[PDB]
Design a protein around this ligand. Sequence first.
Ligand SMILES: [Zn+2]
Ligand SMILES: [Zn+2]
Length: 922
Amino acid sequence: GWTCQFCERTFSTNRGLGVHKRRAHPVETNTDAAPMMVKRRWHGEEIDLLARTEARLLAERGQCSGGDLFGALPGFGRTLEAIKGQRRREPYRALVQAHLARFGSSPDAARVLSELLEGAGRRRACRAMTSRQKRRAEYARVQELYKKCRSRAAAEVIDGACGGVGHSLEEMETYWRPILERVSDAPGPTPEALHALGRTQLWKPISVEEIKASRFDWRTSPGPDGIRSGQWRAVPVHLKAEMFNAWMARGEIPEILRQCRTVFVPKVERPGGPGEYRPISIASIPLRHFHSILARRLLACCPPDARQRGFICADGTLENSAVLDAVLGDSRKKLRECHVAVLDFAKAFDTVSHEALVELLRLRGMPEQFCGYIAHLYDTASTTLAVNNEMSSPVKVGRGVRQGDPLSPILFNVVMDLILASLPERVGYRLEMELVSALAYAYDLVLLAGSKVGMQESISAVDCVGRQMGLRLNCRKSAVLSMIPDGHRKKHHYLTERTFNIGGKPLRQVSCVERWRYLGVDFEASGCVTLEHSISSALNNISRAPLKPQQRLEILRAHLIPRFQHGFVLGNISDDRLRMLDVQIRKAVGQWLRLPADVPKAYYHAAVQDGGLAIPSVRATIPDLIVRRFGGLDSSPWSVARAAAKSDKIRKKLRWAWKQLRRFSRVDSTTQRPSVRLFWREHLHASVDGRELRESTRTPTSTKWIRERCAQITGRDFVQFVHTHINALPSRIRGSRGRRGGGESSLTCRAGCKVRETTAHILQQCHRTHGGRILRHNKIVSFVAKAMEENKWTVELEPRLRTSVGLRKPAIIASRDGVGVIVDVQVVSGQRSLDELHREKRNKYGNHGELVELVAGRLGLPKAECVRATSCTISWRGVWSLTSYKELRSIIGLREPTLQIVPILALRGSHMNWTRFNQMTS
DNA sequence: CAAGCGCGGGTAAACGGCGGGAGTAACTATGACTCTCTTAAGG
DNA sequence: CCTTAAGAGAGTCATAGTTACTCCCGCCGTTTACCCGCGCTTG
RNA sequence: GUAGAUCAGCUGAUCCAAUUUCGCCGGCCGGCGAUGAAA
Ligand SMILES: [Zn+2]
Ligand SMILES: [Zn+2]
């Protein structure tokens, strides 16, 4: 008889109806879950602020009471009677007395840099002086990007919308240029704040050892200097040290190397307008390299605050995000009030007054020389916007802190330390007895509080210190999530109406179903739930983008995968959804590669070395990533993370991930650490198609055509190389995988070899194909022959020698300082171990004796033992032979690229044989 | 100087946080019962 | 002189586990709406 | 008609093919630069 009032469904009992609303109709039951606030319990933060206000009030006046405390506390939300009845409590009066007591207290270097600066200045002066054609233009653009700064073209394609900004210099310059030019009027930090913050030598000559000890990824865009990676790599380390010391002592860099080319980058996948682009600054390469060493020095010498884990976020978002999920889950399980403010400091990197930064650096203990250098550098900052090959008039910066400089994120860390210390001390969440207040990600700040008044006080504190620093707290992207349980009913509930005011302009309140992201992670008022299946759109964007099949596979390999498994890891996903995602990815790859549907699953997800296509399968690589990232939580130096590890939700997720990884991996022999690569290798070298693909593991270069060298193979050539590699050729037996009720004519060779029509039969022993076989053979031997004549060998192919036994035909011979070069070329099957075939071909030459003496007489080598027979063997699937690999690596000296290209030749010859057979199929 | 108002001690009569107890809608793992595909050796 | 009695790999789908909730009863600690004055102000 | 082919009704769409635009040094012809997203 019980029926829902929102879905008119019938349920046997009211309990089932209640859970029905809770799962089916969240918003209205959330409204029905709002608690009455008649006699709200007094939480510790209210006690603290009440006692501190009385302490001050008193000290300043001598005698005060609730009638004055209402005036001093407008938004406290407690009546004049509640203040009195609470005031009489003994711990409170003692705590007031506690705060009352506390409150009552080389010429060559010069020449080379002159040449480089002259070249840069010449370049600067020169720079200062239909649907079908639309697609062909996108092809030119995307290819010219993809062979360079690949993460550019990749992001541009997964968000493929002709993503070259678009909004134009116009609409951009009108938005940002006034902001970038307007000098902040920040008064600076008040002495009280500096005293609160108060609760180490940097300037020193550079060292070459630390110059090489500095990591620096050379895969970096130049600036407007026109100094690219290569010419700065040409600069030696001692010269680098000399110039760095010169600039270090002088304190100034040549003007040319301090310019910028500001470029605009979206934050959300769909750019709504000019207010969604981060104006990143790109300076010279030499400046960036010099600055990264100082950045490391400052990071090591002066570690940040304990609660500051945002500028080490290369592997630091793992802790902040994990702790956030843990605290949200804890507040849900034990029904404890929790207010979380997600404040945004985007655009705050360009609103830090130099007048406010210089003295903050001065009074933090930094040396005067360093402060002066930073002040000078930021005083003469001049950028030139560039969008889609169009460049603004020069713009003079007036708010400093360039989002693309090595020091910018650590020089902002001191402002972060100030603002972090500004907040009240005893405000936050007691997660497992440990107090957590702010997980300050470099960009997204987050404030945690127990009660409304404490959260509002923290908001006011951050606003005040931001205003003193000149920082503007944008009220658009910032939000507040409130979790106020209903006592006496054990119902969790979230507020809806806006309550907290960030210096006025009330903030947005998130709710049960509204989706929000704290640094790209799906979130909600209940916690991390799931991702919104944007993979389909990304795959579609890749498919329509003008890419070759190898470039699509590489983008899917390296860029989309990590991008989305980051959120997958921080998310909560069932393995069924991971399986569906894996299937979708597999089908998309099949469409891009024209592979049939009978290809084994392991082929896609096997490692490159093992012969597969990589393509990290989420179903197995996600539990591995979760286990790897959450194993060290219990050993985290930061105590809050250790406390969060105790939360049952994290433990449950870790247990589930361990189970899945155990099911989908094999224990390595050496490290005794589970690995999925072994799992996919074992599965791949088990199926009928993959059985021949066995010796690839022992030979590293055999598969170097899949990922390393897949830049010279054409799209058609690549998609047939992949077809042949996994034996995708549609022979009768291959097509018989499902249908064998037809007569054995349909199972037997088309040309009439009266045997089972196997693919190997087609390539290697069908009569017609013989021709193509020889065409491959010659090709191969000719190719490796050239190697001899770039290794200084007197080569000669096919020795026409008639031994007493008969007419044995060697492939090539050569000579250089002795050492026989009796080399045989073989392209073999894969059903027999390549090493035994190599031995069988080797012994029939070396142990012949008569042939040995014959070739010795032909070459004229003085000693019969001075010769050395050998054969290079590779299966038609393109797998090298280990013994031959070492043989031509060691004896007949050769560089590895030459042996790297042989598989390409072998695969090309094999598929050429197939196409020849198919066109003489008659 | 008496009456009125702001400033503080006392009472007590509903909030509310929690323990104990019995359940279930909605997914979400499988255990296990049905349909296809595969190497040889011995009298 | 070719087989053939077993092996070993998924299937929609049935069934059980599990996850995140539910509502009722009762209990003691909490909180603040009144009540009762004392000290300063005002007529 | 497309850089080329192909499926369509001079136009559209798909490809295993597909280097667009500007400046410059020069002879419709060659070469160079710009067209180069963070740490
Ligand atoms: Zn309903
Ligand atoms: Zn044949």
